[PDB]
């Protein structure tokens, strides 16, 4: 058993052709595209005229990066590594022209230039020749190219075939051919073909390249575990991929290509949590933002009304999405994500100002309003929300019930409010208590009238300011809390308790102070959701193993799969749907799905009849292969029914006898090793 990059058995690989169908109604195919290298490439070619001539490997296939070139031109094999400037359609140009004599190759159009050469080989043949015979593809060549830890390995095999299409069903191992110590980073590769000049091709004279009948197949290796069979001479005469079907896995586990009748545990299946769950206690009682926002009375800008918010949770998504506010400026903070954080001090300042003055309510703004009526700090993580109020703050005759402060000794500090009747006096022209020259009262009249323009209409502005303190925060927004999912395996995190299980409705009655739930083994059994108070149970995910019920490979290769201790609905979720397409999902689900007490049985047909137990499944259920033939699961019969004819005066005296010899085997000793 070897774990290495292999081509999975019964895979489905790409097919390429290079052929010009006779006549103008046919197809002119020159398949030679640049293909990814992946972690390994399997290359096969069925040919009779030897159109294939080599390969190209590299990352960009240009002078930018190093590349590897392999070509054979009917008497040599050349391997080179250079920063070749490959053509977009490289090939070898065969020519029927009699320049010297016979067919020859004369148009080497693979690469424009070779630079920064590292090494070159002139190794001996893959010959092959320049012959153009027809009929069936008489040779089959298989190659495996691998590039690992700075070494490039090439395996190859050559066999004669009598096929005309597809690949033979025979089995053959590809012996190593060459290994190269190259640190190149192969990622894309391309195929080289020997084209024929239509200008100088037998019968054809039109300008162009024509390709003879050629067919090659490309596959990609994957990391697989294979069970290879070495014969007396060391040749790999057979192999088994340990991923193809349950029978293959059973053979691989038993390390044998022949499996006897019985049930074998091959692997263990686990159901992973779907995506996630995270939960913390959502929120305390809502804060009274409506009072400030929908306040019956609003104070002047110089006397903005402040409401302190504490012992609650901020919530404004209902009004934010309404889009009913003319301004929702949140400076330096997301308009919604700010709520998800603890805030020790929260304030709501409401005032009525002119529409043009709303722009002055910004952190760090300076002016006759910001520096004298409402000053915001630079560290303003709050939001200033302004909306028109002409429908309430306007009437016939106008309103004259507002004041604003314009004169003061110094600019106001952030969240600084001061109301006084002291008369401001100029330094050079003091008044000493009177409103004289260069002396003005701090407050000035202010108001609105219906005739005012849009920019001059009243606007209600509410500022929700937040600041952090060392003291514990009361207005806090919860951390990432997702929605609850039930009856579905998932990885949950309840207030720091990380667990994986299935959340379901529970009838257990906790206590008001109880959150967790435990069993005799001190394992989390039930949990209470902190956001909303209800009790949910915790259950393991699936656990359980996988057993491959099968008769002997001799007789039939049909098998059945048993998944212990799981409902028959979770079988495809146990990391299934990723195995081999045509062999595993058939046993993953389908018809004849039976729910035994020992687990879920698939591939076996339940039968009313009861027979002698053939293969023990468990809980009185046994499986047999005999009935067209198919695996059947039944309740084993504990022998044939009988009822002795008993009466008070009847006896049975035997009239004949049989001398029966029976064999008993008893181990007497085990090998005495030291």
């Amino acid at each position: 058993s070897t774990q290495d990059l292999f081509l999975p058995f019964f895979s489905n690989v790409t097919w390429f052709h290079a052929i010009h169908v006779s006549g103008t109604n046919g197809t002119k195919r020159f398949d030679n595209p640049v293909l990814p290298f992946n972690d390994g490439v399997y290359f096969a070619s069925t040919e009779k005229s030897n159109i294939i001539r080599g390969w190209i490997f590299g990352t960009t296939l240009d002078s930018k990066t190093q590349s590897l070139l392999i070509v054979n031109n009917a008497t040599n094999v050349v391997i080179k590594v250079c920063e070749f400037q490959f053509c977009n359609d490289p090939f070898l140009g065969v020519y029927y022209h009699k320049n010297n004599k016979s067919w020859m190759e004369s148009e080497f159009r693979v690469y424009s230039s070779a630079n920064n050469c590292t090494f070159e080989y002139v190794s001996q043949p893959f010959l092959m020749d320049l012959e153009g015979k027809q009929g069936n593809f008489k040779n089959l060549r298989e190659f495996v190219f691998k590039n690992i830890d700075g070494y490039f390995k090439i395996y190859s095999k050559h066999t004669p075939i009598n096929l005309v299409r597809d690949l033979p069903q025979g089995f053959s191992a590809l012996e190593p051919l060459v290994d190269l110590p190259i640190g190149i980073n192969i990622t894309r590769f391309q195929t080289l073909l020997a084209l024929h000049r239509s200008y100088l091709t037998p019968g054809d004279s039109s300008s162009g390249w024509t390709a003879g009948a050629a067919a090659y197949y490309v596959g990609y290796l994957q990391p697989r575990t294979f069970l290879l069979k070495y014969n007396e001479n060391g040749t790999i005469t057979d192999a088994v991929d340990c991923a193809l079907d349950p029978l293959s896995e059973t053979k691989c586990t038993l390390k044998s290509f022949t499996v006897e009748k019985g049930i074998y545990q091959t692997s263990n299946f686990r159901v992973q949590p779907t995506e996630s769950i995270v939960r913390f206690p959502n929120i305390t009682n809502l804060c009274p933002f409506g009072e400030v926002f929908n306040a019956t009375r609003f104070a002047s800008v110089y006397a903005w009304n402040r409401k302190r918010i504490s012992n609650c949770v901020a919530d404004y998504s209902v009004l934010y999405n309404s889009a009913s506010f003319s301004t929702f400026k949140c400076y330096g903070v997301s308009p919604t994500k700010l709520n998800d954080l603890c805030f020790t001090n929260v304030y709501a300042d409401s005032f009525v100002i002119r529409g043009d003055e709303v722009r002055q309510i910004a952190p760090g703004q300076t002016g006759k309003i910001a520096d004298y009526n409402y000053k915001l700090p630079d560290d303003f993580t709050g939001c200033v929300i302004a909306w028109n109020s002409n429908n309430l703050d306007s009437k016939v005759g106008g309103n004259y019930n507002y004041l604003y402060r314009l004169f003061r000794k110094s600019n106001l500090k952030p969240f600084e409010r001061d109301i006084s009747t002291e008369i401001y006096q100029a330094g050079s022209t003091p008044c000493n208590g009177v409103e004289g020259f260069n002396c003005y009262f701090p407050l000035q009249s202010y108001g609105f009238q219906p005739t005012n323009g849009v920019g001059y209409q009243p606007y209600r502005v509410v500022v929700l300011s937040f600041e952090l303190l060392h003291a514990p925060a009361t207005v806090c927004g919860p951390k990432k809390s997702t929605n609850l999912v039930k009856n579905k395996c998932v990885n949950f995190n309840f207030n720091g308790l990380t667990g994986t299980g299935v959340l379901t409705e529970s009838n257990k009655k906790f206590l008001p102070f109880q959150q967790f739930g435990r069993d005799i083994a001190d394992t989390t059994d039930a949990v209470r959701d902190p956001q909303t108070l209800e009790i949910l149970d915790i259950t393991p995910c699936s656990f359980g193993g996988v057993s491959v019920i099968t008769p002997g490979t001799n007789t039939s290769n049909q098998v059945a799969v048993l998944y212990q201790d799981v409902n028959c609905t979770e079988v495809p979720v146990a990391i299934h749907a990723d195995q081999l397409t045509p062999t595993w999902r058939v046993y993953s689900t389908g018809s004849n799905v039976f729910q035994t007490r020992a687990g879920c049985l698939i591939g076996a047909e339940h039968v009313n009849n009861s027979y002698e137990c053939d293969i023990p499944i468990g809980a009185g259920i046994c499986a047999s292969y005999q009935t067209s033939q198919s695996i059947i699961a039944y309740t084993m019969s504990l022998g044939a029914e009988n009822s002795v004819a008993y009466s008070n005066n009847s006896i049975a005296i035997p009239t004949n006898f049989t001398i029966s010899v029976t064999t008993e085997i008893l181990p007497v000793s085990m090998t005495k090793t030291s």
Partner: nanobody
Framework: HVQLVESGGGLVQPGGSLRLSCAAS????????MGWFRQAPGKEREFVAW?????????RYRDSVKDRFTISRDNAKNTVYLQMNSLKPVDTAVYYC??????????????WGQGTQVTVSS
């Protein structure tokens, strides 16, 4: 007892760059603003920069240190990293790291360290 320890100081000629670091221990600093202050010999201490540990990083700098000094913090380690770029001789001073609260929207230091010398001269 909340304690602050500085590191990363030394001598750096003009045109160089440095990384000053301070580690804070004693309690969680999620609701704390972390910043740096410097005081040159013969001159009063001056505010350099401060940054908030909230999910939204609120960051500030003094007028002279705009676009040349950078401040960052890591809440997992309760550490603050300060980047000096395009240092001039005027930057020679003792630099301290401060843990403070956000009072009235102004960074108010609460805990101070010992400080490290950062000299700028050829």
């Amino acid at each position: 007892h909340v304690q602050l320890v500085e590191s990363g100081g030394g001598l750096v000629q003009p045109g160089g760059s440095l990384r000053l670091s301070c580690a804070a221990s004693g309690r969680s600093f999620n609701s704390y603003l972390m910043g740096w202050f410097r005081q040159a010999p013969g001159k009063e201490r001056e505010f350099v920069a401060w940054i908030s540990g909230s999910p939204h990083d609120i960051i500030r700098y003094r007028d002279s240190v705009k676009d040349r000094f950078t401040i960052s913090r890591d809440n997992a380690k309760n550490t603050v990293y300060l980047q000096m770029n395009s240092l001039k001789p005027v930057d020679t001073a003792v630099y301290y790291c401060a843990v403070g609260s956000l009072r009235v929207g102004s960074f108010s230091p609460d805990y101070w360290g010992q400080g490290t010398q950062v000299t700028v001269s050829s």
